[PDB]
């Protein structure tokens, strides 16, 4: 068998970013910034021909309804996609395609983003081509409306329609061949891997058959004999018949418990305590780190589509807590870390549901997408926040070192190091703390990289609130004066 859960990064780089609904021209430009800040790669929105939905006007979710496997999408043309992949690969920042293989469109008919028609009522997709024989139907799904209802029934979850999305027959050799041709075309252009959408709704054996058809990566950039990187979106918070552990033999799996648990802890929901993170990871009932793709939020659950609705998951709308959770995730050693990168929208929670959760990316109309301008109130650019990218640098310097020198106060303050490379103190209490601890670091003067620009003096004050330098004594102990409130954490580390 082939295993696909191993990614490939340039030395010093590891973290990936979901540039949600970014155009190809903007990602191509961003790859220089990403390389300079030693990110490893970018998850891109579905790049194949997708539905154009005009009621409501051009929602983000139209891109999760494929119309064909041509490569003209809201983010740009096939030419712009290949320009992006070439430029990014040449910079050592790789591309992971959001691959939508479980389904085509919902009901109704229309014209996709590349001019091909679709008809969900007659199951006709002439741009592929698919017809009714290529879909699950009444022979495979016994629910009255043909949709999924009982998530304790794996056959229903995998053969019925997710919210009416016409469900492809992944057991058929024709569908397996067509979908592998799509993936291999993108690998041939230089794509490094795939975020596979809706994997809980597909049979592992069908995924195995598709992945077995894949070509290895393009040796213009990648080592000879290297499998594509595959991570699978499987939503598994327990209490269902489909499990994340069914998919880990194929590749990595999205661990949604990770963001649920860190969200509840940092929010202090129902008496949670930051000190409980002392054993965070697989010991919390999660996937092993080697099999997991981890993240604080993603494009679905920042819109309330995850467990709890709103109130557990942390997003850029809860920026201070979001930064605390992301800093912990980046400083810890658990999973392949993905950072969400978002756009603003008029989130309007009524009875626990966002009435405006459909709104697409910043647009001037007609279904276009604006050019990105970070921090303009429309593009959030979390990956460009100093607290984020400086903790990515911390994460990179710490690579290969275990967690060491753990301390906690029993409640909402913790601290720990990564070997002799970095140390972080997180004060989620409502009072200030002065505490001397073994940091494990060599004696010297360090800057707090949460508030400052650099890791050593001169610390750099581009954010205006760079804290006083931290002195690590000869014995490695440092005295941490850590305040409560905004950015209530100090992180120090050595040079690469």
Binding-site residues for Ca(2+): 102, 158, 167, 201
Residue span binding Ca ion (CB under 5 A) among the ranges 23-31, 69-77, 165-173, 463-471: 165-173
**Residue list 288-307, contact with Cl ion (CB under 5 A):** 298
Q: Indicate the residue among 135 and 394 with the shorter CB distance to Ca ion.
A: 135
Query: Nearer to Ca ion by C-beta: 146 or 367?
Result: 146
Which residue, 142 or 288, is less far from Ca ion as judged by CB?
Answer: 142
- Residues belonging to the binding site are 102, 158, 167, 201
**Could you tell me whether strands 41-44 and 94-99 are parallel, antiparallel, or unpaired per DSSP bridges?**
parallel
Q: Phi/psi at 12 (nearest 5 deg)?
A: 85, -5
Residue 216 makes CB contacts below 8 A (sequence gap 6+) with 187, 222, 224, 225, 226, 227, 228
**Of residues 380-439, those binding Cl ion (CB under 5 A):** none
Nearest distance, CB of residue 203 and Ca ion, angstroms: 8
Whichever of 102 and 116 has its CB closer to Ca ion, that residue is: 102
The one of Ca ion, Cl ion, none whose footprint includes residue 261, by CB under 5 to 8 A per kind, is none
Report how far apart, in Å, the C-alpha atoms of 484 and of each of 100, 428, 433 are.
44, 7, 8
Q: Which two tokens stand for residue 354?
A: 């966002």
- Please, where are the H alpha helices in 200-248? 204-211
Supply the minimum distance, in Å, between the C-beta of residue 55 and Cl ion.
27
Rounded to the nearest whole angstrom, what is the least distance from the CB of residue 202 to Ca ion in the complex?
5
Comparing CA positions, the residue from 206, 173, 214, 200 lying closest to residue 300 is 200
Task: Give the per-residue contact string, 88-117, with Ca ion (x = CB under 5 A; - = no).
Answer: --------------x---------------
Pick the binder of Ca ion from 134, 167, 206, 357 (CB under 5 A).
Answer: 167
Radius of gyration of the chain (CA): 23
CB of 165 or CB of 459, closer to Ca ion:
165
Q: Which does 201 bind (CB under 5 to 8 A by kind): Cl ion, Ca ion, none?
A: Ca ion
DSSP 257-315: HHHHHHHHHHHTGGG--GGGGGG-SGGGTPPPGGGEEE-S--TTGGGT-STTSSSSS--
Shortest Cβ distance from residue 299 to Cl ion (Å)?
Answer: 7
Taking CB under 5 A as the rule, does residue 161 contact Ca ion?
Answer: no
342 counts as binding Cl ion under rule CB under 5 A: no
Q: Closer to Ca ion by CB, 172 or 275: give it.
A: 172
Whichever of 135 and 247 has its CB closer to Cl ion, that residue is 247
| Binding partner of 302, given Ca ion, Cl ion, none, CB within 5-8 angstroms per partner class | none
Is residue 20 within 8 Å of 341, Cβ to Cβ? yes
- Rounded distance between C-alpha atoms, residue 118 and residue 168, angstroms: 14
Which of Ca ion, Cl ion, none lies near 233, with the C-beta cut-off 5 to 8 A by kind?
Answer: Cl ion
The upper half-sphere exposure of residue 227, i.e. CA atoms within 13 Å in the direction of its Cβ, equals 17
How far, rounded to the nearest angstrom, does the alpha carbon of residue 170 sit from its chain's CA centroid? 25
Tell me if 222 sits within 8 A of 192, measured CB to CB: yes
Beta pairing, strands 477-482 & 433-438: antiparallel
Cβ atoms of residues 30 and 19 within 8 Å: yes
Residue 233 in contact with Cl ion, rule: CB under 5 A: yes
Give every strand in the sheet of 444-446, ordered side by side: 433-438, 477-482, 470-472, 444-446
Q: How many residues bind Ca ion (CB under 5 A)?
A: 4
Choose the one of Cl ion, Ca ion, none that binds residue 70, judging by a C-beta under 5 to 8 angstroms depending on kind.
none
Least distance between Cl ion and beta carbon 371 (Å) = 25
Nearer to Cl ion, 89 or 254 (CB): 254
Query: Running DSSP on this structure, what letter comes out for residue 124?
Result: B
Q: Which of 185, 199, 306 is nearest to 252 (CA)?
A: 199
- Output the smallest distance, CB 96 to Ca ion, in A: 22
Closest distance of CB 20 from Ca ion, Å: 24
* Shortest Å distance, C-beta 7 to Cl ion: 15
Distance CA 66, CA 234 (A): 19
The contact set with Cl ion (CB under 5 A) reads: 233, 254, 298
The contact set with Ca ion (CB under 5 A) reads: 102, 158, 167, 201
């Amino acid at each position: 068998f082939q295993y696909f859960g191993s990614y490939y990064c340039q030395p010093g780089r590891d973290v990936i970013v979901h540039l949600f609904e970014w155009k190809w021209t903007d990602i191509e430009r961003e790859c220089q910034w990403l390389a300079d800040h030693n990110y490893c790669g970018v998850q891109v929105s579905p790049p194949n021909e997708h539905r154009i939905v005009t009621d409501p006007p051009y929602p983000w979710w139209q891109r999760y309804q494929p119309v064909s496997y041509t490569m003209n999408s809201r983010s740009g043309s096939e030419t712009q996609f290949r320009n992006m992949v070439t430029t990014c690969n040449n910079l050592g920042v790789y591309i992971y395609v959001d691959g939508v293989l479980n389904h085509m469109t919902g009901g109704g008919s229309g014209t996709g983003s590349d001019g091909n028609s679709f008809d969900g009522d007659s199951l006709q997709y002439p741009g592929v081509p698919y017809g009714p024989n290529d879909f699950h139907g009444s022979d495979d799904c016994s629910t009255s409306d043909g949709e999924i209802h009982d998530y304790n029934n794996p056959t229903e979850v995998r053969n019925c329609r997710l919210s009416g999305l016409r469900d492809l027959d992944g057991s058929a050799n024709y569908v397996r061949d067509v979908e592998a041709e799509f993936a291999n075309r993108l690998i041939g252009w230089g794509v490094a891997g795939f975020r596979l959408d809706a994997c809980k709704h597909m049979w592992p054996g069908d995924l195995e058959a598709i992945l077995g058809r894949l070509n290895q990566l393009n040796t213009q950039w990648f080592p000879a004999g290297r499998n594509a990187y595959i991570y699978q979106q499987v939503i598994d918070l327990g209490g269902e018949a489909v499990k994340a552990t069914e998919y880990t033999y194929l590749g990595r799996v999205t661990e949604f418990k990770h963001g649920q648990n860190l969200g509840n802890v940092v929010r202090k929901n129902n008496g949670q305590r930051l000190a409980n993170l002392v054993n965070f990871g697989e010991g919390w009932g999660q996937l092993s780190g080697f099999d997991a793709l981890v993240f604080i939020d993603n494009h679905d659950n920042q819109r309330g589509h995850g467990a709890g609705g709103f109130g557990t998951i942390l997003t850029f709308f809860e920026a201070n807590m979001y930064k605390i959770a992301t800093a912990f995730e980046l400083a810890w050693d658990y999973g392949h870390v993905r950072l969400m990168s978002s756009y603003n929208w008029p989130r309007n929670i009524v009875n626990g549901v966002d009435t405006n959760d459909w709104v697409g990316p910043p647009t001037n109309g007609g279904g276009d997408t604006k050019d990105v301008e970070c921090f303009n109130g429309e593009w959030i650019c979390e990956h460009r926040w100093r607290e984020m990218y400086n903790m990515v640098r911390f994460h990179n310097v710490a690579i290969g070192n275990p967690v060491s020198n753990w301390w906690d106060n029993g409640f909402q303050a913790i601290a720990f190091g990564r070997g002799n490379r970095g140390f972080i103190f997180i004060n989620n209490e409502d009072f200030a703390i002065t505490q001397t601890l073994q940091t494990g670091l060599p004696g010297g003067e360090y800057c707090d990289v949460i508030s400052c620009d650099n890791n050593r003096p001169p610390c750099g004050n581009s954010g205006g609130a760079c804290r006083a330098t931290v002195i690590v004594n000869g014995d490695g102990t440092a005295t941490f004066d850590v305040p409560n409130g905004e950015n209530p954490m100090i992180a120090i580390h050595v040079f690469l």
